[PDB]
Design an enzyme around this catalytic site. Structure first.
Site, PDB file in Angstrom:
ATOM      1  N   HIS A  68       0.746  -1.054  -0.031  1.00  0.00           N
ATOM      2  CA  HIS A  68       0.032  -0.091   0.049  1.00  0.00           C
ATOM      3  C   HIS A  68       0.819   1.163   0.098  1.00  0.00           C
ATOM      4  CE1 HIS A  68      -3.381  -2.857   1.362  1.00  0.00           C
ATOM      5  NE2 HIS A  68      -4.010  -1.981   0.684  1.00  0.00           N
ATOM      6  N   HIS A  72       1.425   1.760  -5.985  1.00  0.00           N
ATOM      7  CA  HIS A  72       0.032   1.470  -5.854  1.00  0.00           C
ATOM      8  C   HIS A  72      -0.725   2.767  -6.195  1.00  0.00           C
ATOM      9  CE1 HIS A  72      -3.586  -0.314  -4.666  1.00  0.00           C
ATOM     10  NE2 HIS A  72      -3.784   0.841  -3.690  1.00  0.00           N
ATOM     11  N   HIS A 106      -5.630   8.112  -2.015  1.00  0.00           N
ATOM     12  CA  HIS A 106      -6.734   7.173  -1.335  1.00  0.00           C
ATOM     13  C   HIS A 106      -5.958   6.020  -0.234  1.00  0.00           C
ATOM     14  CE1 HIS A 106      -5.186   3.832  -3.983  1.00  0.00           C
ATOM     15  NE2 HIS A 106      -5.663   3.084  -3.029  1.00  0.00           N
ATOM     16  N   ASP A 107      -4.593   5.873  -0.261  1.00  0.00           N
ATOM     17  CA  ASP A 107      -4.050   5.017   0.769  1.00  0.00           C
ATOM     18  C   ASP A 107      -2.898   5.915   1.359  1.00  0.00           C
ATOM     19  OD1 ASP A 107      -5.232   2.443   0.794  1.00  0.00           O
ATOM     20  OD2 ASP A 107      -4.149   1.656  -0.847  1.00  0.00           O
ATOM     21  N   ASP A 217      -8.877   0.610  -7.727  1.00  0.00           N
ATOM     22  CA  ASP A 217      -8.002  -0.316  -6.556  1.00  0.00           C
ATOM     23  C   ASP A 217      -7.406  -1.599  -6.507  1.00  0.00           C
ATOM     24  OD1 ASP A 217      -6.848   0.363  -3.961  1.00  0.00           O
ATOM     25  OD2 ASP A 217      -8.602  -0.195  -2.844  1.00  0.00           O
ATOM     26  N   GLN A 269      -6.890 -16.969  -4.358  1.00  0.00           N
ATOM     27  CA  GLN A 269      -6.979 -15.760  -5.408  1.00  0.00           C
ATOM     28  C   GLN A 269      -8.254 -15.987  -6.016  1.00  0.00           C
ATOM     29  OE1 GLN A 269      -5.067 -13.105  -6.505  1.00  0.00           O
ATOM     30  NE2 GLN A 269      -4.421 -13.219  -4.336  1.00  0.00           N
TER      31      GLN A 269
HETATM   32  C1  LIG Z   1      -9.260 -12.993  -0.411  1.00  0.00           C
HETATM   33  N1  LIG Z   1      -7.889 -13.923  -0.359  1.00  0.00           N
HETATM   34  C2  LIG Z   1      -7.655 -15.036   0.556  1.00  0.00           C
HETATM   35  C3  LIG Z   1      -6.434 -15.351   0.156  1.00  0.00           C
HETATM   36  C4  LIG Z   1      -5.826 -16.529   1.025  1.00  0.00           C
HETATM   37  C5  LIG Z   1      -4.566 -16.740   0.766  1.00  0.00           C
HETATM   38  C6  LIG Z   1      -3.777 -17.541   1.401  1.00  0.00           C
HETATM   39  C7  LIG Z   1      -4.672 -18.247   2.167  1.00  0.00           C
HETATM   40  C8  LIG Z   1      -6.089 -18.287   2.517  1.00  0.00           C
HETATM   41  C9  LIG Z   1      -6.531 -17.431   1.736  1.00  0.00           C
HETATM   42  N2  LIG Z   1      -5.849 -14.630  -0.703  1.00  0.00           N
HETATM   43  C10 LIG Z   1      -6.725 -13.763  -1.146  1.00  0.00           C
HETATM   44  C11 LIG Z   1      -6.627 -12.647  -2.112  1.00  0.00           C
HETATM   45  S1  LIG Z   1      -6.908 -10.852  -1.404  1.00  0.00           S
HETATM   46  C12 LIG Z   1      -6.309  -9.880  -2.426  1.00  0.00           C
HETATM   47  N3  LIG Z   1      -6.578  -8.431  -2.383  1.00  0.00           N
HETATM   48  C13 LIG Z   1      -6.459  -7.895  -3.465  1.00  0.00           C
HETATM   49  C14 LIG Z   1      -6.372  -6.567  -3.944  1.00  0.00           C
HETATM   50  C15 LIG Z   1      -6.011  -6.116  -5.493  1.00  0.00           C
HETATM   51  C16 LIG Z   1      -5.444  -7.261  -6.118  1.00  0.00           C
HETATM   52  C17 LIG Z   1      -5.278  -8.674  -5.796  1.00  0.00           C
HETATM   53  N4  LIG Z   1      -5.718  -8.899  -4.229  1.00  0.00           N
HETATM   54  N5  LIG Z   1      -5.973  -9.970  -3.697  1.00  0.00           N
HETATM   55 MG   LIG Z   2      -7.165   1.319   0.680  1.00  0.00          MG
HETATM   56 ZN   LIG Z   3      -5.643   0.933  -2.511  1.00  0.00          ZN
END
Ligand SMILES: Cn1cc(-c2ccccc2)nc1CSc1nc2ccccn2n1
Ligand SMILES: [Mg+2]
Ligand SMILES: [Zn+2]
Length: 312
Positions: A68, A72, A106-107, A217, A269
């Site tokens: 962040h 970004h 924003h961050d 975002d 993901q």
């Molecule tokens: C929701 N989640 C859960 C997991 C996960 C990862 C490892 C073990 C258990 C769950 N990875 C994620 C993806 S979090 C995320 N947030 C953003 C923002 C921008 C671009 C990509 N991602 N991925």
């Molecule tokens: Mg944010």
């Molecule tokens: Zn952001």
């Protein structure tokens, strides 16, 4: 120095594309932002000196966290620029200034810690801001820089318009609180399917801007796969460091923030694409058809994660 920067002509073409990745051009990021503001909003609306001053101060108040961070901020602003260029006329000139600035800011001053962390461990910030904790702080940081000497890029606005642009900025930054997205996209989708959505209806308009902020975002998932993969590394580097602070305190983190559970990343993901990103860009493409290449790119990276899960 930022004042005399000129964007290489090869970039002038590439920067207009949604998939454009800023990553290889670190030294140019501040100048890329100026360029985007000049193209979208014109060369005569901000005093150049002030804009540059404001930009370098926004950069200085981004911390060296894995995700962040300043990189970004510019990535999110670039995605907005391409959304706006492709939908120029749907938005007011005031909305374009505010929304580009909001994205850059924003961050602002993110510590690498989530809202849940600050709330769970009763951090001061969570005492001043009970919901959308960091996001309220991010806006509060935005106003603070604007209020520095020689930094108020909006000083030639009337009072009425100054408070209009701050309000667009405030809503925009709050919208980046993912907790708020799910409700937003749900309403927007219903408004869309029932033929009831109306861009001249202001509350609707706030919602569409909200979805845009989300779409910006999240835009790592709309880059070419190798850039998408590499950004994921940054995201989890930051999540795992938070989960590490929780373990130190005898708190088991959620799997997402537990580096010992990284085997579950591909499926993590996969879920994020299914529950968050695909739906986001799907509704965004419905409201704003020229943003389709975001959905296309998102789908391509979904199927890459599907490939990964099964030994490919
Ligand atoms: C929701 N989640 C859960 C997991 C996960 C990862 C490892 C073990 C258990 C769950 N990875 C994620 C993806 S979090 C995320 N947030 C953003 C923002 C921008 C671009 C990509 N991602 N991925
Ligand atoms: Mg944010
Ligand atoms: Zn952001």
């Amino acid at each position: 120095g930022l004042m005399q920067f000129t964007l290489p002509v090869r970039l002038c073409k590439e920067i207009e594309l949604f998939h454009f990745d800023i990553g290889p051009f670190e030294n140019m990021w501040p100048g890329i932002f100026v360029y985007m503001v000049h193209r979208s909003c014109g060369t005569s609306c901000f005093e150049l000196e002030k804009l540059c001053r404001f930009i370098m101060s926004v950069k200085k108040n981004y911390r060296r966290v894995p995700y962040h961070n300043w990189k970004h901020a510019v990535t999110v602003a670039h995605c907005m620029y391409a959304i706006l260029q492709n939908n120029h006329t749907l938005f007011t000139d005031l909305e374009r200034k505010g929304l580009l600035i909001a994205c850059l800011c924003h961050d602002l001053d993110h510590r690498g810690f989530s809202n849940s962390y600050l709330q769970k461990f009763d951090h001061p910030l969570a005492a001043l801001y009970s919901t959308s904790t960091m996001e309220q702080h991010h806006f509060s940081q935005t106003v603070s820089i604007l209020q520095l000497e020689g930094h108020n890029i909006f000083s030639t606005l009337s009072s009425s318009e100054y408070e209009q642009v701050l309000e667009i900025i405030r809503k925009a930054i709050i919208a980046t609180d993912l907790a708020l997205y799910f409700g937003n996209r749900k309403q927007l989708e219903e408004m869309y399917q029932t033929g009831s959505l109306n861009l001249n209806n202001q509350s609707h308009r706030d919602r569409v801007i909200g979805l845009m902020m989300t779409a910006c975002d999240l835009c790592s998932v709309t880059k070419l796969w190798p850039v998408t993969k590499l950004t994921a590394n940054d995201i989890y580097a930051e999540f795992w460091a938070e989960g590490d602070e929780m373990k130190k305190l005898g708190i088991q983190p959620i799997p997402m923030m537990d580096r010992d559970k990284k085997d579950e990343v591909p499926q993590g993901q996969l879920g994020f694409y299914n529950a968050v990103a695909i739906p986001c860009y799907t509704t965004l493409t419905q409201i704003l058809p020229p943003t389709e290449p975001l959905l296309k790119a998102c789908r391509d990276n979904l199927s890459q994660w599907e490939k990964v899960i099964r030994g490919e």
